[PDB]
Design an enzyme around this catalytic site. Sequence first.
Site, PDB file in Angstrom:
ATOM      1  N   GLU A   1      -3.831  -7.292  -6.436  1.00 45.07           N
ATOM      2  CA  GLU A   1      -2.955  -8.334  -6.688  1.00 45.07           C
ATOM      3  C   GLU A   1      -1.518  -7.797  -6.583  1.00 45.07           C
ATOM      4  OE1 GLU A   1      -5.946  -7.670  -8.968  1.00 45.07           O
ATOM      5  OE2 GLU A   1      -6.661  -9.808  -8.688  1.00 45.07           O
TER       6      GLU A   1
ATOM      7  N   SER B   1       0.299  -1.103  -0.065  1.00 39.56           N
ATOM      8  CA  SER B   1      -0.258   0.109  -0.281  1.00 39.56           C
ATOM      9  C   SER B   1       0.857   1.377  -0.220  1.00 39.56           C
ATOM     10  CB  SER B   1      -1.315  -0.008   1.085  1.00 39.56           C
ATOM     11  OG  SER B   1      -2.112  -0.921   1.049  1.00 39.56           O
TER      12      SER B   1
HETATM   13  C1  LIG Z   1      -1.601  -1.887   1.717  1.00 38.32           C
HETATM   14  O1  LIG Z   1      -0.517  -2.513   2.230  1.00 38.32           O
HETATM   15  N1  LIG Z   1      -2.785  -2.800   2.035  1.00 38.32           N
HETATM   16  C2  LIG Z   1      -4.203  -1.937   2.644  1.00 38.32           C
HETATM   17  C3  LIG Z   1      -4.758  -1.972   3.733  1.00 38.32           C
HETATM   18  N2  LIG Z   1      -3.261  -1.225   4.035  1.00 38.32           N
HETATM   19  O2  LIG Z   1      -3.252  -0.594   5.626  1.00 38.32           O
HETATM   20  S1  LIG Z   1      -1.936  -0.535   6.415  1.00 38.32           S
HETATM   21  O3  LIG Z   1      -1.154   0.253   5.098  1.00 38.32           O
HETATM   22  O4  LIG Z   1      -2.109   0.303   7.560  1.00 38.32           O
HETATM   23  O5  LIG Z   1      -1.094  -2.329   6.387  1.00 38.32           O
HETATM   24  C4  LIG Z   1      -4.507  -3.331   4.571  1.00 38.32           C
HETATM   25  C5  LIG Z   1      -3.799  -4.314   3.639  1.00 38.32           C
HETATM   26  C6  LIG Z   1      -3.035  -3.874   2.383  1.00 38.32           C
HETATM   27  C7  LIG Z   1      -3.834  -4.876   1.852  1.00 38.32           C
HETATM   28  N3  LIG Z   1      -4.023  -6.614   2.317  1.00 38.32           N
HETATM   29  O6  LIG Z   1      -3.960  -4.689   0.737  1.00 38.32           O
END
Ligand SMILES: *C(=O)N1C[C@H](NOS(=O)(=O)O)CC[C@H]1C(N)=O
Length: 266
Positions: free
Chosen positions: A141, A43
């Site tokens: 993805e 992310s």
């Molecule tokens: C990013 O890596 N993601 C979206 C969301 N991010 O929150 S985090 O950056 O605080 O961990 C959840 C984890 C992840 C995803 N599963 O896409």
Amino acid sequence: SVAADKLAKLERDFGGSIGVYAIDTGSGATVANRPNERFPLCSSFKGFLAAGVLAQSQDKPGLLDKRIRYSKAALPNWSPITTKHQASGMTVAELNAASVQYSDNGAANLLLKEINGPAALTTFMRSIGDASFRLDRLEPELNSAIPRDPRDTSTPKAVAESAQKLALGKALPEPQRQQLADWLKGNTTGNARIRAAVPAGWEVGDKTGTCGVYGTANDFAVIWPPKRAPIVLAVYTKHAKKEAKHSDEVIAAAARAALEAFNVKK
Ligand SMILES: *C(=O)N1C[C@H](NOS(=O)(=O)O)CC[C@H]1C(N)=O
């Protein structure tokens, strides 16, 4: 160095690799570990996506005010803000706030569509002199984090240098830079990561990433102390075993080691 030794010990106990690049913008001093190695963005790409949207807004005024409406069925998993606001739509500015500050995946994919896709974001990054950043896929993805796979990766050095250029420097006009900074400063997801190593009350704009596999997670930050010059820090982890868990504590510990080299201690 002291910092390099501490980072090596963190890696041994973690069982994987910890990439670090820190810049003290006062002295110019740096801390580095595996600076040019690739790590998955997860992310964390969303902070650069925000910069790419702001870059488009120099062309199209009112872009931040444009209201985007979308279907419920089109939202990916992990879309808490966009799900809540489906009936009202969200403006491009609101989508950036949710993408940056809550890591809303639906918001990030909607903004990717606004700026014409991962290749377009990669081109913007190349335009600031970042030759390392590459975004290849959409949420979710892009989080596969397969060892050695170069898709959806950057390097710690390129993350920190680009964060400096975009949130402190002149890669964006001043109003846009301020907006990017303000979005990063209100992040809500980073309290156990770089921020855990920063003296209380100091402003910290950061964006976290958690791929959820291969011990892969990260954080990059711009820290604005009250009495001294800003510091930029990127901390990225990966591990060779699919089931290895990431660690907030490892990221915070690595941040602490780098900041100590700059004589900053919480
Ligand atoms: C990013 O890596 N993601 C979206 C969301 N991010 O929150 S985090 O950056 O605080 O961990 C959840 C984890 C992840 C995803 N599963 O896409």
